[PDB]
Symmetry: D2
Subunit: 114 residues, 4 copies
């Protein structure tokens, strides 16, 4: 699997479970095609999000529903959504882990690229 | 001005100058209307980016072109853009500062709301 | 003033007011001399924390009492303090801004150096 | 093992290998006893840093030699050292992972607490 996520809650110091997300691929004319959805498990991860066959080079977007996560935690959030938009270069079995650190008014998006 | 940005370069320890961005307002059918653009000055800011009248309550997207910033610095970045999406409640001259901390494979988006 | 701080609360989206800190200068035998203290104002800052004359070249530690800040907010933090340790080169009126972003289980320490 | 680390390089998007660190425990009179050293492997981790027997409750400090890491990467760093100072509450087999995101002029210290 070429695309994984790891989400941590910076208020509690635990993985962020039950965070919903959507994965989209940019079209040539600049639009977006949704290709996958998922929800983090209690470890802040999702397994088998997409396959290598679904992951050519190009621009991708992962939308994390952080506003719902914070509302359910009981904290008013700033962001309406957490969008991570990146260029993928899969040639060579390069894998990507999108790491995300969440606070109600702040998040950090990092990548670990194999 | 109710919407400010402050961008920092975490590699150099300086404000991120000459970063292009665009501000868009969400439409009823889920689209986006571009309402302002600019390029940060040497302090990582854009003075007077939008007016009170241009900033009614609603969802906004500020798209920062971080890729070109890094290319110009000589690095190969992960993200295509930095996205900050939020619901604005400008009543009472409430003000929004979008702080952004940039590294080639990571950024942090923080909000300072009056 | 050559040494400034700017502290933000990532839970609330506001500057972190009423954070105690201490500034220490490293000694030859590896010890630490306290040279200044203060408490941030409502903008997350301490105006005029030290003078030019108090800030010769050398290694400094700024210790922020983030634990008590969080206890007072009602959260149970991870860190005992936030530590920022750096070698200062104040020649030419070079200025240092210590930016600090706080959550109960995470902080980011960034430097803006002129 | 009750204390682990995970270090990422935010410039390259890879784990930070070969980062040296020292672990110390605070004494009653406010001093420090070094109890362990280590160096991250190519995954940014260290295994078997300390034992549970070595890890009573108390104040601990992990000093990461990030200045040497950045010098060897070829980038001038801001911080002289990255110090993570925390209260440990091991009762119940609670484990701690110190996560660290490194840029030359910025780092983020987070904890994952089981
Ligand atoms: C404290 C705050 C929000 C900040 C707000 C304003 Br306005 C400033 O001018 C500066 Br200087 C700092 C900040 C921003 C970023 Br970006 C950081 O990486 C970290 Br750490 C802290
Ligand atoms: C989610 C978390 C805590 C993480 C924990 C483990 Br354990 C991992 O192996 C990986 Br990868 C990520 C993390 C860490 C850093 Br350093 C970050 O900059 C961000 Br954003 C998130």
């Amino acid at each position: 699997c070429p695309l994984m996520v790891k989400i941590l809650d910076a208020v509690k110091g635990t993985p962020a479970g039950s965070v919903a997300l959507k994965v989209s691929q940019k079209t040539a004319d600049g639009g977006w095609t949704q290709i996958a959805t998922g929800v983090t498990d209690a470890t802040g991860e999702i397994h088998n999000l997409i396959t290598e066959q679904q992951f050519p080079a190009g621009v991708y977007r992962v939308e994390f529903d952080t506003k719902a996560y914070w509302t359910n935690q009981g904290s008013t959030p700033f962001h309406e959504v957490a969008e991570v938009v990146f260029d993928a270069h899969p040639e060579g079995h390069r894998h990507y882990t999108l790491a995300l650190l969440l606070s109600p008014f702040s998040y950090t998006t990092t990548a670990v690229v194999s």
